[PDB]
A paper describes a structure:
Here, we use X-ray crystallography to study LuxO, the central quorum sensing regulator in Vibrio cholerae and related bacteria. LuxO belongs to the subfamily of AAA+ ATPases known as bacterial enhancer-binding proteins (bEBPs). In LuxO, as in NtrC proteins, the phosphorylation of an aspartate located within the R-domain activates the C domain for ATP hydrolysis and the opening/activation of σ54-dependent promoters. Here, we present crystal structures and in vitro and in vivo functional studies of LuxO that together reveal what is, to our knowledge, an entirely novel mechanism of AAA+ protein regulation, in which a regulatory segment of the protein prevents substrate ATP binding and hydrolysis by occupying a portion of the enzyme active site.
We determined the 1.6 Å resolution crystal structure of a V. angustum LuxO construct lacking the D domain but containing both R and C domains (denoted LuxO-RC). The structures of the individual R and C domain are very similar to those of homologs such as NtrC1 (root mean square [rms] deviations of 1.3 Å and 1.7 Å, respectively), although the relative positioning of the R and C domains is unique. Rather than forming closed rings, V. angustum LuxO monomers in the crystals form continuous helical arrays with six subunits per turn. In the V. angustum LuxO-RC structure, the R domain is nestled between the two lobes of the C domain, forming a discrete interface with each. Interface I is dominated by an interaction between α-helix 5 (α5) of the R domain and α7 of the C domain. In interface II, α4 and β-strand 5 (β5) of the R domain interact with α13 of the C domain. The R and C domains are connected by a 20-residue linker (denoted R-C linker, residues 123–142). Strikingly, residues 137–142 of the R-C linker occupy a substantial portion of the C domain active site, sterically occluding the binding of the ATP substrate. The R-C linker is stabilized in the active site by an extensive network of H-bonds, including four with residues within the R domain and three with residues within the C domain. Gly 141 of the R-C linker appears to be especially important, as it not only makes three key H-bonds using its main chain nitrogen and oxygen atoms but also occupies a position deep within the active site that could not accommodate a larger residue.
Residue numbers in the entry: 3 to 123, 127 to 220, 224 to 388
């Protein structure tokens, strides 16, 4: 059983976060001081440390320093309030793997923990900027609460989940949430983006191929995903010929590797996503109607940023830390007039536009605080 050490001196928060992790079937140990965390580690090296920056006997940075003096590999995820993004960024620079903005929600914590444990000891590869909060999957606006509700109900079912929403609204992270809350959480999570692959290769990427299939026997997504979750992202980009083979695979669980006539089978739970209107794609003859009704079982609609109220403040704070790290700067807060302006703007490009705007600010300015004079058009 994997071990997570939670260094958290607020007992109610530690209990809440431990309850969030219940679906993952882990051994979670709570300590409330740096002394007790370091004592634990002398005996048992955990598979992950969740480390609050604020502790009664020493700072979280001091814990991190003392851990890294003897343990260079154990993953550390920092838990921080808005007010300590400056310290969270310095913690990453010193040797921590990611930071989580508090308060945290159940799905975001499960995704972060599951990704940190699988990265160490096989799912689709992941890095820091792939973290849930940077993709917009953070906050407790009513529209997001509706998403979390469906994830919780659906995760335990094998029924296919069909995710819609504009580009950059959190659809891929929503699929990771389903996986982490499901009984398949410890099995592979495989995401294939159907737009990211050329058409002459996507059948091979999905179903594998044998040696000399086209100008050695490689394993496709369906095989990598066996007993786990297969996510088909940007699914409406798939061509009609491949759609017919996908429908056959969904119905029968059977497939052929490219270049082979041999029949193979796997057991996957399906999630898919599109930023198109899927029924419109059916009406226009671009998407098979039978495939639509086969897949459109448990629908989830991600709300755009303009419908999510105060969530934008949380995402912006996460991204300010991420862009400071990426661009070698030390921004850690926004002025209140900047935040008011971010709340009034409708973000037509959703999280990608938010990332762009914050990156532009961080590249062009050197400050600890984002001020109104830094905000580009068309925001102001």
């Amino acid at each position: 059983q994997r071990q997570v050490l939670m260094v958290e001196d607020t007992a109610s928060v530690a209990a809440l976060y431990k309850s969030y992790l219940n679906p993952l079937g882990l051994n979670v140990s709570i300590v409330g001081t740096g002394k007790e965390a370091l004592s634990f580690i002398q005996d048992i090296i955990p598979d992950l440390i969740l480390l609050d920056l604020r502790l009664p006997d020493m700072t979280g940075m001091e814990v991190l320093e003392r851990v890294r003096k003897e343990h260079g590999n154990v993953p550390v995820v920092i838990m921080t309030a808005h007010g300590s993004i400056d310290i969270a960024v310095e913690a990453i620079r010193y040797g921590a793997q990611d930071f989580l903005i508090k308060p945290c929600e159940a799905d975001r914590l499960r995704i972060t923990v599951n990704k940190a444990l699988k990265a160490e000891s096989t799912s689709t590869q992941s890095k820091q900027s792939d973290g849930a909060q940077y993709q917009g999957f953070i906050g407790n606006s009513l529209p997001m609460q509706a998403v979390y509700r469906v994830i919780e109900s659906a995760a335990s079912s094998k029924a296919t989940v069909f995710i819609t929403g504009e580009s950059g609204t959190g659809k891929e992270v929503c699929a990771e949430a389903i996986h982490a809350a499901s009984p398949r959480h410890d099995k592979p999570f495989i995401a294939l983006n159907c737009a990211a692959i050329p058409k002459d290769l996507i059948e091979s990427e999905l179903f594998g191929h044998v040696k000399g299939a086209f100008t050695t026997e490689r394993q496709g997504a369906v095989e990598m995903a066996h007993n786990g979750t297969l996510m088909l992202d940007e699914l409406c980009e798939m061509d009609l010929d491949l759609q017919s083979k996908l429908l056959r695979f969904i119905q029968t669980g059977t497939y052929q590797k490219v270049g082979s006539s041999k029949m193979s089978s796997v057991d996957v739970r399906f999630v898919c996503a599109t930023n198109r209107n899927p029924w419109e794609e059916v009406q226009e003859g671009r998407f098979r109607e039978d495939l639509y009704y086969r897949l459109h079982v448990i629908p989830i609609s991600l709300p755009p940023l303009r419908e999510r109220g105060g969530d934008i403040i949380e995402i912006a704070h996460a991204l300010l830390g991420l862009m400071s790290l990426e661009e070698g700067k030390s921004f850690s807060r926004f002025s209140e007039p900047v935040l008011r302006l971010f709340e009034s703007y409708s973000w037509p490009g959703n999280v990608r536009e938010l990332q762009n705007v914050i990156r532009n600010i961080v590249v062009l300015n050197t400050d600890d605080e984002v001020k109104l004079e830094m905000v580009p058009p068309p925001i102001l």
